[PDB]
mmCIF file of C-alpha atoms in Angstrom:
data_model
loop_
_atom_site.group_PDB
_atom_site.id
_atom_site.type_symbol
_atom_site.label_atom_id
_atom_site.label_comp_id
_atom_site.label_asym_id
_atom_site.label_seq_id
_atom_site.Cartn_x
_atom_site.Cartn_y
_atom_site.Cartn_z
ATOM 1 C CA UNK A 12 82.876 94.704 141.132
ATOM 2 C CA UNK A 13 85.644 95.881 139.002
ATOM 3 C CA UNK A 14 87.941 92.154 139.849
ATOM 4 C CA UNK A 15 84.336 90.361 139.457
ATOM 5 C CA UNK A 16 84.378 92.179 135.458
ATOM 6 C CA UNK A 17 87.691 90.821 135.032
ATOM 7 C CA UNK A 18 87.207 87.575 136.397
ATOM 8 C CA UNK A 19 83.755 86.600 134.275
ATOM 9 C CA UNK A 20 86.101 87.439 131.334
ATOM 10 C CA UNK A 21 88.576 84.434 132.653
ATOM 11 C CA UNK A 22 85.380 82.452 133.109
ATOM 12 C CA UNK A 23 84.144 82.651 130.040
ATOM 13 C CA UNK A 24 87.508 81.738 127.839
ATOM 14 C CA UNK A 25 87.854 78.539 129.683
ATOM 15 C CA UNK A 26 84.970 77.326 127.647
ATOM 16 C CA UNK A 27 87.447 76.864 124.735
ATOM 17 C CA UNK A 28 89.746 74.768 127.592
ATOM 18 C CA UNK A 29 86.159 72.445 127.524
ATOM 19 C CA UNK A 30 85.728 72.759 124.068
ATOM 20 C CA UNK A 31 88.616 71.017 123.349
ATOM 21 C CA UNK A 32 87.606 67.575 123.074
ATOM 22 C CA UNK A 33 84.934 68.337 120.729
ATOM 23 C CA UNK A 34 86.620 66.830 117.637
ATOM 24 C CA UNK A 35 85.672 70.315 114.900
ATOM 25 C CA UNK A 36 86.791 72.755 117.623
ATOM 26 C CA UNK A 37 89.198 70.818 118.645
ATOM 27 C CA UNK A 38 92.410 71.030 115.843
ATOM 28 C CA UNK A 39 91.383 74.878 115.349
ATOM 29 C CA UNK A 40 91.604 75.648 119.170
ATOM 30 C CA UNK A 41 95.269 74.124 119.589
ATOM 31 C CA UNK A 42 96.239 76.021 115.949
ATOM 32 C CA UNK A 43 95.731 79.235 117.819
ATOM 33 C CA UNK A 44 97.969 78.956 120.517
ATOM 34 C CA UNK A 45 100.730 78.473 117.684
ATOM 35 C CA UNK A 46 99.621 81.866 116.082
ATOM 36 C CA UNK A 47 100.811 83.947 119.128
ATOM 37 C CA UNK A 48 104.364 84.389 117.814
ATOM 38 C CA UNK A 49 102.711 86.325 114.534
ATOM 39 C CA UNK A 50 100.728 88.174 116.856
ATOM 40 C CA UNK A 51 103.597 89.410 119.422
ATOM 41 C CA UNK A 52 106.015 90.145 115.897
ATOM 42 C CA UNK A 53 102.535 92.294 114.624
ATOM 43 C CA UNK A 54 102.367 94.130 118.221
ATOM 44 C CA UNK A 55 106.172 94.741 117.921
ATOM 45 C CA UNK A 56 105.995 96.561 114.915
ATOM 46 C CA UNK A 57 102.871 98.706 115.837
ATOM 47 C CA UNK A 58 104.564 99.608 118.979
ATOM 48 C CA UNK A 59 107.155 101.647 117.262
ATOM 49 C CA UNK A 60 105.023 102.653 114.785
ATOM 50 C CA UNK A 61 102.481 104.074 117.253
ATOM 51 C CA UNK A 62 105.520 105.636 119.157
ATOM 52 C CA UNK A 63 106.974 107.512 116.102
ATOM 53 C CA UNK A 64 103.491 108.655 115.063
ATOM 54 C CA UNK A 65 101.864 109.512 118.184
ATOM 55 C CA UNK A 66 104.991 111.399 119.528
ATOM 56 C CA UNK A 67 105.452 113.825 116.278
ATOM 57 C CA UNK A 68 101.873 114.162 115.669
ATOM 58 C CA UNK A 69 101.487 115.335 119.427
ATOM 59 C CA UNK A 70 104.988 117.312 119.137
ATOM 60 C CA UNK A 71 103.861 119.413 115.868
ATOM 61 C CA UNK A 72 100.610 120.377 117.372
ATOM 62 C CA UNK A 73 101.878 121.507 120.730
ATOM 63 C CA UNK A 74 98.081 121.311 122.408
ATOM 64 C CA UNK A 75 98.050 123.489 125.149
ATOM 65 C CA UNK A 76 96.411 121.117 127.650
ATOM 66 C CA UNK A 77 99.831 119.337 127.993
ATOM 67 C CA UNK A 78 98.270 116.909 130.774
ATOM 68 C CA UNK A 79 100.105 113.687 130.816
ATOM 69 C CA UNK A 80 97.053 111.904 130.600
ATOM 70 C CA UNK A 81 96.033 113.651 127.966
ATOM 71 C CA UNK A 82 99.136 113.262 126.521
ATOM 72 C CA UNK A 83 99.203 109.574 126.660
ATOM 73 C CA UNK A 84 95.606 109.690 125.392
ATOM 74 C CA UNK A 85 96.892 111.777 122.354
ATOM 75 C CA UNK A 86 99.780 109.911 121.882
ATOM 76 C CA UNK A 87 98.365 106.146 122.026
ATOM 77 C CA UNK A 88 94.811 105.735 122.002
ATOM 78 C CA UNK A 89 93.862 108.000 119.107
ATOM 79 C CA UNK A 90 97.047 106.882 116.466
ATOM 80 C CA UNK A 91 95.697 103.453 117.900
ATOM 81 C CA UNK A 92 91.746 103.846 116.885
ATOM 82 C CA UNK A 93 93.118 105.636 113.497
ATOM 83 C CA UNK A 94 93.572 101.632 112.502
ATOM 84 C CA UNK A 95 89.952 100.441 113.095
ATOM 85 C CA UNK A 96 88.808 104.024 110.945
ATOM 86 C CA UNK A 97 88.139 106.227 113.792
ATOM 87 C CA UNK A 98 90.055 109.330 112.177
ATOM 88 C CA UNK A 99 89.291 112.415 113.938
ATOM 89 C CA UNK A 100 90.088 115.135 110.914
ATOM 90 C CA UNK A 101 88.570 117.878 113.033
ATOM 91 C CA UNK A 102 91.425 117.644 116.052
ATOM 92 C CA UNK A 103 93.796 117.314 113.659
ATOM 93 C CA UNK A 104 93.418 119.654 110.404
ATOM 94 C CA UNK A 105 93.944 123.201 111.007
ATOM 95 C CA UNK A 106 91.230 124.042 107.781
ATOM 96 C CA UNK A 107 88.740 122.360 109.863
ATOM 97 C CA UNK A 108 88.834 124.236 113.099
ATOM 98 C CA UNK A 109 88.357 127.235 113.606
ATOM 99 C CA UNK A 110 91.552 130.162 114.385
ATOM 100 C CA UNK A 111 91.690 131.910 117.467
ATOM 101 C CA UNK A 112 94.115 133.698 119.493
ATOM 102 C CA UNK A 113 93.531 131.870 122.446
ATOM 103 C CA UNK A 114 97.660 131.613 123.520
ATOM 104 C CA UNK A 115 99.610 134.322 124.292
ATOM 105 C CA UNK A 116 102.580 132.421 123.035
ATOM 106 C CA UNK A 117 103.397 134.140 119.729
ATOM 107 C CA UNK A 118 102.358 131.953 116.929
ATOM 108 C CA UNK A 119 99.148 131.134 115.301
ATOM 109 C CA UNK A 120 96.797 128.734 116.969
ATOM 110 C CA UNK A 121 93.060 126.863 116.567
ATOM 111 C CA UNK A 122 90.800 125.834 119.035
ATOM 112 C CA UNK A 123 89.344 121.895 117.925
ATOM 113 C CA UNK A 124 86.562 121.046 118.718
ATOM 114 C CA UNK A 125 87.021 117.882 120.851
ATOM 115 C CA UNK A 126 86.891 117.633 123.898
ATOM 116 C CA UNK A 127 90.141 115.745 124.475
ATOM 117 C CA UNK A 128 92.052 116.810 121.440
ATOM 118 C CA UNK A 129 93.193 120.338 123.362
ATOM 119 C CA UNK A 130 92.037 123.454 123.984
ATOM 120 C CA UNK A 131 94.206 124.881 120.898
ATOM 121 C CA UNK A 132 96.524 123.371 118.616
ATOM 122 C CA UNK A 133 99.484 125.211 116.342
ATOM 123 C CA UNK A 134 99.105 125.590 112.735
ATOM 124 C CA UNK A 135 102.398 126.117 111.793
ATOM 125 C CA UNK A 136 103.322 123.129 109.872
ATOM 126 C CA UNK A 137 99.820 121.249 109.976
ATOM 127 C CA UNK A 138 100.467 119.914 106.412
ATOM 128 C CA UNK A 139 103.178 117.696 108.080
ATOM 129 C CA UNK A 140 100.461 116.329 110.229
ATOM 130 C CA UNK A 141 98.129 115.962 107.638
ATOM 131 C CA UNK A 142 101.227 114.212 105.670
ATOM 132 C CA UNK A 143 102.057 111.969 108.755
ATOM 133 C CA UNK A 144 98.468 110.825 108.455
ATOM 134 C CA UNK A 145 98.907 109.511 105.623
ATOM 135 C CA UNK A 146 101.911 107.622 105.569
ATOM 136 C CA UNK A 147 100.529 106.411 109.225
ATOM 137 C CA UNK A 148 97.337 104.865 106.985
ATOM 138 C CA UNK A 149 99.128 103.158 104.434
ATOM 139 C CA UNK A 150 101.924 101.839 106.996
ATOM 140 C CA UNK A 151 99.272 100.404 109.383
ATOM 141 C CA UNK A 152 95.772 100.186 108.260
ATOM 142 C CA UNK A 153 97.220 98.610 104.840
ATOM 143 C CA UNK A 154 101.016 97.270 105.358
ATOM 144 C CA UNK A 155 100.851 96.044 108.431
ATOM 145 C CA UNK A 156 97.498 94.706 108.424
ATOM 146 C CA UNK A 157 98.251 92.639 104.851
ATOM 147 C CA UNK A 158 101.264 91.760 105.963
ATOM 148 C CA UNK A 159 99.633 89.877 109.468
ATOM 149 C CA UNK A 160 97.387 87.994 106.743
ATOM 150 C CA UNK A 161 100.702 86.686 105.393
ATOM 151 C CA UNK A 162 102.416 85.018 107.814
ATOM 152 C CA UNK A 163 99.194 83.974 109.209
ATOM 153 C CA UNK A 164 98.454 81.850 106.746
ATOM 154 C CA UNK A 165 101.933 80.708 105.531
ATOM 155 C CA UNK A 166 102.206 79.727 109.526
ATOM 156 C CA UNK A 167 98.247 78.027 109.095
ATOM 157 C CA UNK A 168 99.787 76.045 106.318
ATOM 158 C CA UNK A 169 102.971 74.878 108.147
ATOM 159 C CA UNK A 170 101.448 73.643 111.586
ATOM 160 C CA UNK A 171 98.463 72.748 110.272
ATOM 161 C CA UNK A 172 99.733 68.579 110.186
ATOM 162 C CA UNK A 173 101.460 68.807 113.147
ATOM 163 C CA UNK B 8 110.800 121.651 116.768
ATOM 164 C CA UNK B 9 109.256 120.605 113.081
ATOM 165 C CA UNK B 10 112.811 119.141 112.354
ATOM 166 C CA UNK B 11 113.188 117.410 115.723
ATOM 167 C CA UNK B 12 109.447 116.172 114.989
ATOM 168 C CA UNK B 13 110.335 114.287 111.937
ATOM 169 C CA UNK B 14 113.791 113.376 113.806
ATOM 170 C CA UNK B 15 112.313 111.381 116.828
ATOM 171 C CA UNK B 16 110.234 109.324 113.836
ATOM 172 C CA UNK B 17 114.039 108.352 112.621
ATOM 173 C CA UNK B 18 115.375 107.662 115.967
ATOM 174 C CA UNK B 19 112.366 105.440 116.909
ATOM 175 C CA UNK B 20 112.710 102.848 113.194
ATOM 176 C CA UNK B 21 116.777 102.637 114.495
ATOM 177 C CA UNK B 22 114.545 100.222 117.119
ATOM 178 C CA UNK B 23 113.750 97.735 114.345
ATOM 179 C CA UNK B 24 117.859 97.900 113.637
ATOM 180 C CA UNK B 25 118.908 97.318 117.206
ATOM 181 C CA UNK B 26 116.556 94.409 117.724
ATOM 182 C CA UNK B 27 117.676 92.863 114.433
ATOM 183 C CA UNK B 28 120.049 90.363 116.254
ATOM 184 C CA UNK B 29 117.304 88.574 118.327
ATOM 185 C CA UNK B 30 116.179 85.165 116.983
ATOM 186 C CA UNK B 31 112.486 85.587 117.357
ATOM 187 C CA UNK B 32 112.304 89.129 115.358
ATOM 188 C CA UNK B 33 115.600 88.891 113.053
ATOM 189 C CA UNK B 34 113.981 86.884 110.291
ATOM 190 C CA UNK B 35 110.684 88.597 110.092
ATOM 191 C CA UNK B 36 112.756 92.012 109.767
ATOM 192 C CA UNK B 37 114.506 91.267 107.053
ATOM 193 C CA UNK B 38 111.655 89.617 104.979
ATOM 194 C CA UNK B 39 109.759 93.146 105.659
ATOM 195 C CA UNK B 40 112.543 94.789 103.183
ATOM 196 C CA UNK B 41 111.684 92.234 100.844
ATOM 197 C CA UNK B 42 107.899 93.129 100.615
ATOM 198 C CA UNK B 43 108.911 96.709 99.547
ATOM 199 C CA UNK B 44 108.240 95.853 95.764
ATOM 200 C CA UNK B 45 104.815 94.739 96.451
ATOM 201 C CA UNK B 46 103.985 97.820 98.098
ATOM 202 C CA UNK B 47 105.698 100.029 95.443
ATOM 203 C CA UNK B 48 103.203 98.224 93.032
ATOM 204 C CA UNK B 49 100.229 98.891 94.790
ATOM 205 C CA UNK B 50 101.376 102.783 95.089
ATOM 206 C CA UNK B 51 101.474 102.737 91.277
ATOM 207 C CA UNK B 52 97.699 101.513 90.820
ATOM 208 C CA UNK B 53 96.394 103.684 93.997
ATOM 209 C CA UNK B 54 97.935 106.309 92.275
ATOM 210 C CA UNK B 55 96.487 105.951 88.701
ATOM 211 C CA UNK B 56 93.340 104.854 90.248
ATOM 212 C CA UNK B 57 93.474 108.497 92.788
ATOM 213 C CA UNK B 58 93.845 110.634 89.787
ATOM 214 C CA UNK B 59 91.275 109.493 87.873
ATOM 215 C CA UNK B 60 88.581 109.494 90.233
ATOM 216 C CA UNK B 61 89.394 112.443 92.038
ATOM 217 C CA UNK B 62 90.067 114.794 89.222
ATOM 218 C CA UNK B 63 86.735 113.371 87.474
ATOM 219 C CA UNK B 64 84.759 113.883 90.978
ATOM 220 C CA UNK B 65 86.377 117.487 91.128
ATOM 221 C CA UNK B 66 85.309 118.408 87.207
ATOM 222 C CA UNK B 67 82.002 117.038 87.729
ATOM 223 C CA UNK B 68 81.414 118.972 91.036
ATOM 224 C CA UNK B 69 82.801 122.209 90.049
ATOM 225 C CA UNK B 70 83.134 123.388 93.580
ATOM 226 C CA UNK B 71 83.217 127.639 93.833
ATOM 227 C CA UNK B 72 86.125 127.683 96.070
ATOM 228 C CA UNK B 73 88.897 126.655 93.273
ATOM 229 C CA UNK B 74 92.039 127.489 95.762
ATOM 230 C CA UNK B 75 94.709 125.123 94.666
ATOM 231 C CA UNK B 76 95.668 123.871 97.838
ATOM 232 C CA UNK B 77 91.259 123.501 98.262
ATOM 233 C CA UNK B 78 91.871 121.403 94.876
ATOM 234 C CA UNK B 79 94.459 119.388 95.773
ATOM 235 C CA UNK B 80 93.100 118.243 98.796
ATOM 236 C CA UNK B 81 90.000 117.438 97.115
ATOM 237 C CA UNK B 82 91.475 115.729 94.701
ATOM 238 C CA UNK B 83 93.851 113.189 96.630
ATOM 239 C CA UNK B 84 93.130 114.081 99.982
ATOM 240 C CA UNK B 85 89.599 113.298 100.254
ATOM 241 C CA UNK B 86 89.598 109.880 98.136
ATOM 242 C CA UNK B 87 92.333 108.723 99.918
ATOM 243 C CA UNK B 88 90.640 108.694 102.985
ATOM 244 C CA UNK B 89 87.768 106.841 101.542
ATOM 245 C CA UNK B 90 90.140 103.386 101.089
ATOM 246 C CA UNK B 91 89.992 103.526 104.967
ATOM 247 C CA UNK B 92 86.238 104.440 105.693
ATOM 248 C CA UNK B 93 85.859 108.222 105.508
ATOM 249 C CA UNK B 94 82.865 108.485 103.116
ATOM 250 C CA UNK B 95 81.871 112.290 103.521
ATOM 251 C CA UNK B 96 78.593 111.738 101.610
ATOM 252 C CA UNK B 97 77.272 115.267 102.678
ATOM 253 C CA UNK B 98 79.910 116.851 100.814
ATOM 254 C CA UNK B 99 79.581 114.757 97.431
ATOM 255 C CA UNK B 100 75.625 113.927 97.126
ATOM 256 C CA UNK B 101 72.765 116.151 96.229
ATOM 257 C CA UNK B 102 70.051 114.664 98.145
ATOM 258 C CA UNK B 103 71.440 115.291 101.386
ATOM 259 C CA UNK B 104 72.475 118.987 101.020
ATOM 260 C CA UNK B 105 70.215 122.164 100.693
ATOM 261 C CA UNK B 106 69.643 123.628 97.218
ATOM 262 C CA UNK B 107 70.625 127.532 97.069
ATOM 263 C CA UNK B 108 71.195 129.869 94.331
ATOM 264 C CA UNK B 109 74.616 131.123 95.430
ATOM 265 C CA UNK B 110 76.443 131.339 92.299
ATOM 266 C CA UNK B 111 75.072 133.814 89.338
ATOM 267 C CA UNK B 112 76.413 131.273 86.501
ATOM 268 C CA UNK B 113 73.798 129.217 85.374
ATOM 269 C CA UNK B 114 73.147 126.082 85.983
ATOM 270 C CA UNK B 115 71.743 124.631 89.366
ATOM 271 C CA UNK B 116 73.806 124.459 92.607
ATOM 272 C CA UNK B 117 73.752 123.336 96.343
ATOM 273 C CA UNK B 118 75.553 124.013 99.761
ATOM 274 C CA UNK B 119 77.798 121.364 101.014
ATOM 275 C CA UNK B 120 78.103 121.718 104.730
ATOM 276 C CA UNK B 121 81.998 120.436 104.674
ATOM 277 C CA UNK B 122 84.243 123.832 105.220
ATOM 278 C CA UNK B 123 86.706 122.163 102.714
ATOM 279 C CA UNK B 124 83.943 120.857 100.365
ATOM 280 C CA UNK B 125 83.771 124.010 98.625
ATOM 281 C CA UNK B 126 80.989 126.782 99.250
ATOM 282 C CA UNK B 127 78.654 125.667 96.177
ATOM 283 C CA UNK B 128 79.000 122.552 93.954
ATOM 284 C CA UNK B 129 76.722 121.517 90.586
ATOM 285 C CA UNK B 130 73.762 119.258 90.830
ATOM 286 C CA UNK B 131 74.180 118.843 86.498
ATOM 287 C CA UNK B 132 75.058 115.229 86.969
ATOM 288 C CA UNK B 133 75.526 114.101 90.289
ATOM 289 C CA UNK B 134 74.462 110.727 89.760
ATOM 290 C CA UNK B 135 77.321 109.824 88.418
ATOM 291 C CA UNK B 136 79.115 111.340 91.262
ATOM 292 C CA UNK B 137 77.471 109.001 93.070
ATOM 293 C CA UNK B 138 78.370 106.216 90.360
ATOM 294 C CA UNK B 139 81.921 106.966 90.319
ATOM 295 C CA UNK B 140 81.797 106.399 94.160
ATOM 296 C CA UNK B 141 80.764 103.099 94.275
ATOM 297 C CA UNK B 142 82.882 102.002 91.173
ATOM 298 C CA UNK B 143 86.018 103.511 93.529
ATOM 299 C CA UNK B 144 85.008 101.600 96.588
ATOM 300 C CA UNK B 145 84.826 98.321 94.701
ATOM 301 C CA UNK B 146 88.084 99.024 92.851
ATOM 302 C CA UNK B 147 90.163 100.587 95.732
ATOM 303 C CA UNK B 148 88.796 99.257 99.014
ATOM 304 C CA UNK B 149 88.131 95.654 97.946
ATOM 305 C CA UNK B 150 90.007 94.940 94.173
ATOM 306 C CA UNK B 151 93.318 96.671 95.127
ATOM 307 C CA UNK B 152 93.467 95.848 98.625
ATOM 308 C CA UNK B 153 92.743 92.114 98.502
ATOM 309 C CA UNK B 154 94.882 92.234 95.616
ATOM 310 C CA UNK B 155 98.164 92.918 97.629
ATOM 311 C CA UNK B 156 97.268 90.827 100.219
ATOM 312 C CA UNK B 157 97.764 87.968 97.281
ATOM 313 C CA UNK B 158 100.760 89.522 96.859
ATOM 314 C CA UNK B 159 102.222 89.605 100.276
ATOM 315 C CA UNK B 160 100.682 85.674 100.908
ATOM 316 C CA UNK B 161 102.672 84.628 97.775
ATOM 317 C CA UNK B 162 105.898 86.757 98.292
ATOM 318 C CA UNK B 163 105.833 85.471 101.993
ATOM 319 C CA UNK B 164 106.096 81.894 101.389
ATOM 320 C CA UNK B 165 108.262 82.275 98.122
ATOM 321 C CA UNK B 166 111.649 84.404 100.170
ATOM 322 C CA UNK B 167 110.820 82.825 103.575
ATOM 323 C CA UNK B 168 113.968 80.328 103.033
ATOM 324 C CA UNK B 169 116.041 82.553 101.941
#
């Protein structure tokens, strides 16, 4: 089943291969293919973004979970759905959860509330990750983003005749 | 480790200098510095725009708590995160908390159910809290933001040959 999920996505974009001819799909579908090397630039620079972010975000809080797929989960996915305004300010902010002494490593630690975000995170310089935050918003939601809608449509304009 | 935290963020943006040599990324690097005054521009009217709506939200609430690191997050913490979709209408709207006489100064107050949103805010005038909310959704999310995407199209295309 799980190659038959894959394979009905194939399926179904070859319908813009047979759309082609139609002549108001047509020009737009072969414009697209010509967008790709935005696209790859856009993923190039959200890579390292998403690597600097993810990694000190994850290194400051020190979750004591420490699996490395929960690691990778902490590291990618989240800083990733922090673009499309899933911001989880509860696994993050230390004035949100609530302080335990759940670790016997000296230090002081909070438990969040998620269920993948850790069992407890440190709180020793959480207004770093709260600053991180927000130069991660304004870098990616807003500079990145714009700056995709720029050289999309100064590249629209150029290839547009040919 | 909350040096070496902030240091891995440096090491990983050498990246974009390493791969400024290849043909495919080298020119859209190097345009990216020259977007920097468009963005500084933008930080100017956020800014303005931050102050003035969050410090009139603040007076008008007259949250209890008063801490100053409680005010300064609700000042530019809070409508910050708004640009990108965190609306915490709970915290800021009479209608949807519980009325309670908690504080002995008179006047008429309710519970927010935020930890951070203070422990008791005035209902005096909360309509314009409300007003002030949707003015700085149309101004921030939509005026400013579309704004510097005008900016970026028209910088784009101007330095591109150069």
């Amino acid at each position: 089943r799980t190659v038959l999920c894959i394979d009905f996505m194939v399926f179904t974009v070859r319908l813009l291969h047979i759309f082609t001819v139609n002549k108001q799909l047509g020009p737009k579908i072969v414009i697209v293919s010509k967008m790709m090397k935005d696209v790859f630039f856009f993923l190039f620079f959200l890579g390292v973004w998403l690597v600097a972010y993810g990694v000190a975000t994850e290194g400051l809080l020190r979750p004591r979970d420490s699996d490395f797929p929960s690691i990778l989960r902490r590291v990618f996915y989240r800083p990733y759905l922090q673009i499309f305004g899933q911001i989880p300010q509860e696994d993050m902010d230390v004035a949100l959860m609530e302080h335990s002494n759940c670790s016997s490593e000296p230090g002081f630690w909070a438990h969040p509330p998620g269920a993948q975000a850790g069992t407890c995170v440190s709180q020793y310089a959480n207004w770093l990750v709260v600053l991180l935050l927000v130069i991660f918003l304004l870098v990616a939601n807003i500079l990145l983003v714009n700056l995709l809608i720029a050289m999309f449509s100064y590249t629209f304009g150029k290839v547009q005749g040919n």
